[PDB]
Amino acid sequence: AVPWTELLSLQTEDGFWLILNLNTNGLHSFLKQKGIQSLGVKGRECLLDLIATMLVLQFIRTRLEKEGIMKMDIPWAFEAIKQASEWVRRTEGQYPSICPRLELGNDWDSATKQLLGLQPISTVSPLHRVLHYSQG
C-alpha cells in the first residue's frame, strides 16, 4: 500500500530522483565525510541524483518481487521506469568502481539493499548509523 501516484507527483523533469522512509540528513552527512565535495559542485549533484534514482529503482524492484514478478525497463508506470532506467544507464559509465570507493558495497545491488535496510550490515562496515540515527 505504498504511495504510487505520489511518486510520479515528485517525478523530476529529466528522469532523476517520506515516500522512501530513509534518513536523508544522516545520509548526506555520511557522504559529506567521504569527500563528495572534491568531485565538483556539478558532479556531486549528479552523483546524488544517481544514488536517489537507484534507490527508487530498488524500492520498485522490492515492491515487484514480493509478488514474484538497468534491466528493469505494470504497464501504467512503464514510461517513468523506462526513462529512469535510460537515465541510469547513461551516467553510470562516468563512475567505474564508485560504490567501493565511497564505501557502500561491491556494486549497486549490494549498495541499495544495505541502504534500503532489508539486508544485514557488518561491523567492519561504517554503514551502521544510517538506519540507527533515525532510531535516535
Partner 1 sequence: TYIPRKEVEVVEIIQATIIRQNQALRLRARKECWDRDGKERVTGEEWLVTTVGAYLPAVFEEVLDLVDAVILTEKTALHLRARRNFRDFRGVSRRTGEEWLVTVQDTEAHVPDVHEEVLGVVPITTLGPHNYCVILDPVGPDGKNQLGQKRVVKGEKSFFLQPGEQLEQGIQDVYVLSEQQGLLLRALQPLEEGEDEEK
Binding site for a copy of itself (CB under 8 A): 10-13, 16-20, 22, 24-25, 28-29, 32, 36-38, 41-42, 44-46, 48-49, 52, 55-56, 61-62, 64-72, 75, 78, 92, 105-110, 113, 118-120
Of 99 and 115, the one with the shorter C-beta distance to partner 1 is 99
Cβ pair 50, 12 in contact under 8 A: no
- Asked if 94 touches partner 1 (CB under 8 A), the answer is yes
CA angle 20, 127, 58 (to 5 degrees): 35
Question: Binding to partner 1 by residue 36, rule CB under 8 A?
Answer: yes
d(CA 45, CA 2): 27
Nearer to partner 1 by Cβ, of 1 and 41: the residue is 41
Residue 24 or 135 having the CB closest to a copy of itself: 24
Residue 103 zone, left/alpha/beta (φ > 0; ψ -120 to 50; rest)? left
Smallest distance from partner 1 to CB 19, Å = 29
The single residue listed with the C-alpha cell 541510469 is: 88
CA distances from 114 to 77, 122, 131 (A): 26, 10, 10
5-24 residues near partner 1, rule: CB under 8 A: none
